[PDB]
Amino acid sequence: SVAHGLAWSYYIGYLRLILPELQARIRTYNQHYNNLLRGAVSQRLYILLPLDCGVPDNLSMADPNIRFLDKLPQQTIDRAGIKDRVYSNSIYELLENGQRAGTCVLEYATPLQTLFAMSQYSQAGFSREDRLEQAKLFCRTLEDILADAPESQNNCRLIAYQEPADDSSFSLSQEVLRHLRQ
Amino acid sequence: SVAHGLAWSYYIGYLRLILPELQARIRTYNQHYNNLLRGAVSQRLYILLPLDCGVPDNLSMADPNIRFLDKLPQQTIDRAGIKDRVYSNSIYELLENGQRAGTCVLEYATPLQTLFAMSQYSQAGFSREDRLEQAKLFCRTLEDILADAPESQNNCRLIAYQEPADDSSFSLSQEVLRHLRQ
Ligand SMILES: Cc1ccc2c(=O)c3cccc(CC(=O)O)c3oc2c1C
Numbered sequence: 001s002v003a004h005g006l007a008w009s010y011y012i013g014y015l016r017l018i019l020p021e022l023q024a025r026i027r028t029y030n031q032h033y034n035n036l037l038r039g040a041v042s043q044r045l046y047i048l049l050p051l052d053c054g055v056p057d058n059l060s061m062a063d064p065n066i067r068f069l070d071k072l073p074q075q076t077i078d079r080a081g082i083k084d085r086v087y088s089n090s091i092y093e094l095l096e097n098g099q100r101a102g103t104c105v106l107e108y109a110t111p112l113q114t115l116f117a118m119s120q121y122s123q124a125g126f127s128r129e130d131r132l133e134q135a136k137l138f139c140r141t142l143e144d145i146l147a148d149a150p151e152s153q154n155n156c157r158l159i160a161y162q163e164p165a166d167d168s169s170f171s172l173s174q175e176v177l178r179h180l181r182q
Numbered sequence: 183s184v185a186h187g188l189a190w191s192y193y194i195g196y197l198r199l200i201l202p203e204l205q206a207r208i209r210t211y212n213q214h215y216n217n218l219l220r221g222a223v224s225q226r227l228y229i230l231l232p233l234d235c236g237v238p239d240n241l242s243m244a245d246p247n248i249r250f251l252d253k254l255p256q257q258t259i260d261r262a263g264i265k266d267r268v269y270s271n272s273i274y275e276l277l278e279n280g281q282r283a284g285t286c287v288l289e290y291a292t293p294l295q296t297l298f299a300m301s302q303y304s305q306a307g308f309s310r311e312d313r314l315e316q317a318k319l320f321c322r323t324l325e326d327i328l329a330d331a332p333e334s335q336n337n338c339r340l341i342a343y344q345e346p347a348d349d350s351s352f353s354l355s356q357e358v359l360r361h362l363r364q
């Protein structure tokens with residue numbers, strides 16, 4: 001399955017690298033800033049899983065209640081196959097009623113970009129329907145992997161959603177917040 | 183298929199982001215004052231593809247006739263879902279008769295690590311036999327993509343190999359050199 005490999009490669013090639021040091025980098029960030037006397041970031045890495053596989057260039061631009069705040073301190077890698085890559089994660093501000101309301105490390109799952117690309121290239125032989133099925137399957141497979149992984153306990157949260165074509169103008173921020181509030 | 187998703191993901195998530203500025207970076211390295219006239223590096227990316235999916239943390243060690251020379255200058259990333267990542271690529275010298283006989287940018291394909299891991303975790307439901315067939319399928323799929331991809335013409339080389347049953351006398355060095363001298 002396309003989704004199966006993606007769920008595994010996302011875990012092996014990213015999450016494992018990132019997760020172990022994440023709580024620490026966040027502790028660093030909360031104590032070391034100011035900037036600023038007003039904080040403060042949640043402990044998990046919130047992963048966005050749009051089922052439509054729509055990933056924006058800019059997460060901030062896309063939503064008006066999600067505003068880029070800052071970056072976490074950088075991380076360096078020396079697990080196998082990666083040496084001297086430099087990584088960063090981004091912190092976002094969430095507003096509710098022009099207020100408050102959350103500060104968290106937030107990012108789109110990169111393999112959705114791949115699922116989208118595949119759907120648009122004739123060479124992939126991958127239909128838009130295939131994409132939706134694999135996107136759901138990707139989410140389920142990843143949930144399962146993470147549930148059992150030593151690296152991934154209490155420091156990661158999956159936010160899966162579809163924005164309904166029918167009626168409503170969906171709130172990404174309400175979605176993130178609902179997950180956030182625990 | 184697992185391979186299909188891995189190959190497409192490797193193209194979308196690494197190659198088409200790294201290849202466009204590769205030749206520019208190589209020449210810049212080739213130009214540099216410090217870079218003694220000895221050893222003009224070749225202009226393509228040499229991607230190692232062990233079919234047994236064995237990937238060492240240290241390539242230079244796998245073959246004594248293959249030694250790490252230097253690092254290319256770092257590349258910073260703009261692209262979406264990745265802001266401010268920093269990539270680096272490594273330069274290696276190859277030897278014939280104990281003396282340098284080639285210089286090239288050389289690395290193992292990361293998704294083979296994932297295929298190896300999947301074979302090692304019960305949850306992946308992935309056998310060793312599965313792994314080999316998926317590794318061959320990965321190489322084939324990647325070839326087809328790069329065969330007609332705009333990002334990837336004349337700047338990339340795939341070296342796929344199996345180390346024989348009769349001997350470990352198999353030399354990667356010669357395999358790489360073989361491709362290297364043409
Ligand atoms: C831009 C981009 C697009 C897709 C992937 C990806 O599918 C993918 C799948 C598994 C692991 C990685 C590596 C990572 O997310 O750092 C991946 O990275 C991607 C990147 C960086």
Ligand SMILES: Cc1ccc2c(=O)c3cccc(CC(=O)O)c3oc2c1C
Pocket residue numbers: 009010012013014080081082188191192195196292293294295296
């Ligand atoms: C350490 C490691 C292991 C596996 C992958 C991977 O499967 C994988 C698959 C597709 C894309 C990427 C990203 C990349 O290789 O830069 C991938 O990165 C991985 C990395 C960095």
